[PDB]
Amino acid sequence: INFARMYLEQSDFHEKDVCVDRSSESVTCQTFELTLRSCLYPHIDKQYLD
Amino acid sequence: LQPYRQALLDLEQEFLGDPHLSISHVNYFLDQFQLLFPSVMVVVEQIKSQKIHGCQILETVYKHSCGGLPPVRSALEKILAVCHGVMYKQLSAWM
């Protein structure tokens, strides 16, 4: 394990997004306040209620 | 104006390609925009002078959209389509 970590695990360390783009469905995208109310506010209200 | 910019860039590239081209070639190539632009400029100046606001601007554009120049007609159709898209978005929100 020690030699693996120092040499082999050292060698094999090739261990090298919210698309908020309205462009796709701008006509279908809710208003910023409407989008907030429908995605965040309902969840916030649910947590508050619980 | 984007198509005009594109035409200007293509003209620049073509003139870079051939050192024997003269300004007459540009004047030929740009004549379509030399006819198109004055009417749109007149329309914009009229819009500015009448201070058309909100959807009342759309009505004025429609009146102007009824022009007789086919290229101007097409351009105003594009503009009207954009304005109708905005109107439809507002109408969607209302409905």
From Swiss-Prot, chain A:
Organism classification, top ranks?
Eukaryota, Metazoa, Chordata, Craniata, Vertebrata
Its subunit composition reads: Component of the gamma-tubulin ring complex (gTuRC) consisting of TUBGCP2, TUBGCP3, TUBGCP4, TUBGCP5 and TUBGCP6 and gamma-tubulin TUBG1 or TUBG2. TUBGCP2, TUBGCP3, TUBGCP4, TUBGCP5 and TUBGCP6 assemble in a 5:5:2:1:1 stoichiometry; each is associated with a gamma-tubulin, thereby arranging 14 gamma-tubulins in a helical manner. Gamma-tubulin at the first position is blocked by TUBGCP3 at the last position, allowing 13 protafilaments to grow into a microtubule.
Query: What does the UniProt entry say about where the protein is found?
Result: Cytoplasm, Cytoskeleton, Microtubule organizing center, Centrosome
- Show the stretches that span the lipid bilayer: none
Q: Which cysteines does the record link by disulfide bonds?
A: none
Q: What is this protein called?
A: Gamma-tubulin complex component 5
Domain of life of the organism encoding this protein: Eukaryota
Q: What does this protein do?
A: Component of the gamma-tubulin ring complex (gTuRC) which mediates microtubule nucleation. The gTuRC regulates the minus-end nucleation of alpha-beta tubulin heterodimers that grow into microtubule protafilaments, a critical step in centrosome duplication and spindle formation.
Task: Provide the free-text tissue specificity comment from this protein's UniProt record.
Answer: Widely expressed, with highest levels in heart and skeletal muscle and moderate levels in brain.
Coiled-coil annotated residue ranges, if any: none
Would you identify the family this protein belongs to, as annotated? Answer: Belongs to the TUBGCP family.
Swiss-Prot record, chain B:
Cellular compartment(s): Cytoplasm, Cytoskeleton, Microtubule organizing center, Centrosome
Q: State the superkingdom.
A: Eukaryota
Q: In which tissues is it expressed?
A: Ubiquitously expressed.
Query: Which illness does the annotation name?
Result: Microcephaly and chorioretinopathy, autosomal recessive, 3: A disorder characterized by congenital microcephaly and chorioretinal dysplasia associated with poor vision and nystagmus. Variable ocular anomalies include microphthalmia, retinal folding, retinal detachment, optic nerve hypoplasia, absence of retinal vessels, round areas of chorioretinal atrophy, and attenuated electroretinogram. Most patients have mild developmental delay and mild learning difficulties.
Q: How does it assemble?
A: Component of the gamma-tubulin ring complex (gTuRC) consisting of TUBGCP2, TUBGCP3, TUBGCP4, TUBGCP5 and TUBGCP6 and gamma-tubulin TUBG1 or TUBG2. TUBGCP2, TUBGCP3, TUBGCP4, TUBGCP5 and TUBGCP6 assemble in a 5:5:2:1:1 stoichiometry; each is associated with a gamma-tubulin, thereby arranging 14 gamma-tubulins in a helical manner. Gamma-tubulin at the first position is blocked by TUBGCP3 at the last position, allowing 13 protafilaments to grow into a microtubule.
Q: Which family does it belong to?
A: Belongs to the TUBGCP family.
**Reported function:** Component of the gamma-tubulin ring complex (gTuRC) which mediates microtubule nucleation. The gTuRC regulates the minus-end nucleation of alpha-beta tubulin heterodimers that grow into microtubule protafilaments, a critical step in centrosome duplication and spindle formation.
Protein name according to UniProt: Gamma-tubulin complex component 4
The gene it comes from is TUBGCP4
